[PDB]
C-alpha cells in the first residue's frame, strides 16, 4: 500500500537507482510528522467504537428513510443497526491506520478501491456514510497536530464518496 516510505521506494526502484536528494527529504518529512499520526491512532484506539455508536444514531435523525423502510435490505431491523456501527467502525479503523502510515494507503485499498461499484450494487447511498463521517469530525474533540492528521484522512474519505 501507499505510504510516503513506499511511494519513494517505488519511484526509486522504477528508475533503478537509490533515493534521490528530493525523495530522502520527503522521507525525513514523514518522521518529523509521524508522532502526531501515532497519537491520532491512539485516540481512535481508545474511543473509536464509542464515536461509531453515536454516528449510527445521527443518521437515523438526519435521514428518516433508513429506519422506516423494509426488512430484507434496510436499517429498520436491530440487525441493520449492528451493521451500521460495524461499517462506520470499519471506516474509523481504516482512518486510524492512515495516521499510523502517514498516507492515504489504507483508505485506498481497504475502502476506495471498488467503492462506487459496491454501493451501486447493494443499494447503499454514500449520503449516509458522508453524514456520519461529518459527525465524528466535529465531535471528536482533538487538539491540533493530532487533529490535523485526523481531519486530513476523514476528509479524504468524504472526498472519495462524494
Amino acid at each position: 500500500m501507499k505510504t510516503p516510505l513506499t511511494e519513494a521506494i517505488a519511484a526509486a526502484d522504477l528508475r533503478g537507482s537509490y533515493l534521490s536528494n528530493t525523495e530522502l527529504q520527503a522521507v525525513f518529512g514523514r518522521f518529523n510528522r509521524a508522532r502526531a499520526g501515532l497519537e491520532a491512532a491512539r485516540a481512535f484506539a481508545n474511543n473509536g467504537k464509542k464515536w461509531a455508536e453515536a454516528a449510527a444514531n445521527h443518521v437515523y435523525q438526519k435521514f428518516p428513510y433508513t429506519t422506516q423502510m423494509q426488512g430484507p435490505q434496510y436499517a429498520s431491523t436491530p440487525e441493520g443497526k449492528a451493521k451500521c456501527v460495524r461499517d462506520i467502525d470499519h471506516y474509523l479503523r481504516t482512518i486510524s491506520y492512515c495516521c499510523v502510515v502517514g498516507g492515504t494507503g489504507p483508505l485506498d485499498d481497504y475502502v476506495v478501491a471498488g467503492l462506487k461499484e459496491f454501493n451501486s450494487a447493494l443499494g447503499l447511498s454514500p449520503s449516509w456514510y458522508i453524514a456520519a463521517l461529518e459527525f465524528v469530525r466535529d465531535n471528536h474533540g482533538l487538539t491540533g497536530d493530532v487533529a490535523g492528521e485526523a481531519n486530513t484522512y476523514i476528509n479524504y474519505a468524504i472526498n472519495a464518496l462524494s
Partner: protein, 172 residues
C-alpha cells in the same frame, strides 16, 4: 509493497482491531531511532559503488576458479552481471532498512532467485559469500564513528545484518 508501519496495519486489519498500546509504542520506537536509520540509508547509498566493488574483489580471491575459464562467471558480460546482481541485493537491502520491512527485497528481488541461478548454472553458495562480504563491508561504513553525532545504533546494525543474511539464505 509494505513498510514497518503498514505491516502491523495489515495484521491489525486481519483481526479487525485498532492498533494496541504495545503496537503504537513499538512503532513510536522506530520514529525515535529514525534519524539513525536514515544515516544508515545514506551511508550505504553513498558507498554503494565501493561496497559492491570490494566484495567482488574479495570473492574472486576466495574463489578464483569461478571467475577464470571454465567457471560460471567468465567473460566481460558475466563479470558485469555479477557486480550488477550484487548491486541489486545492496540496493534492496537499503530499501529494507528504510521501509523497516523486508517485503521489497522479498517481492521484487529474492522471489525466484534460487530458481534463476539453478537454471543459469550460477552457484549460489558463491553469491551468498558475496552477500556476506557486502555485509562486513557495509557494517564498517554504516557504523563509522567519524562524521556523525556519537550514539548507539546497535538495533540498526543487527537489523541491517539480518537483511543481508536473509538475502544469502535465499540463494544458498
Amino acid at each position: 509493497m509494505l513498510d514497518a508501519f503498514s505491516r502491523v496495519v495489515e495484521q491489525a486489519d486481519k483481526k479487525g482491531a485498532y492498533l494496541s498500546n504495545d503496537e503504537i509504542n513499538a512503532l513510536q520506537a522506530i520514529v525515535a531511532d529514525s534519524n539513525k536509520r536514515l544515516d544508515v540509508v545514506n551511508r550505504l547509498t553513498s558507498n554503494a559503488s565501493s561496497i559492491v566493488a570490494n566484495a567482488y574483489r574479495a570473492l574472486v580471491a576466495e574463489r578464483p576458479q569461478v571467475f577464470n575459464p571454465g567457471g560460471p562467471c567468465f567473460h566481460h558480460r558475466n563479470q558485469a552481471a555479477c557486480i550488477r546482481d550484487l548491486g541489486f541485493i545492496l540496493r534492496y537491502v537499503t530499501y529494507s532498512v528504510l521501509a523497516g520491512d523486508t517485503s521489497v527485497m522479498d517481492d521484487r528481488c529474492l522471489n525466484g532467485l534460487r530458481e534463476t541461478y539453478q537454471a543459469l548454472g550460477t552457484p549460489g553458495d558463491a553469491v551468498a559469500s558475496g552477500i556476506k562480504k557486502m555485509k562486513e563491508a557495509a557494517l564498517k561504513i554504516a557504523n563509522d564513528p567519524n562524521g556523525i553525532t556519537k550514539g548507539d545504533c546497535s538495533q540498526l546494525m543487527s537489523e541491517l545484518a539480518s537483511y543481508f543474511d536473509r538475502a544469502a539464505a535465499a540463494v544458498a
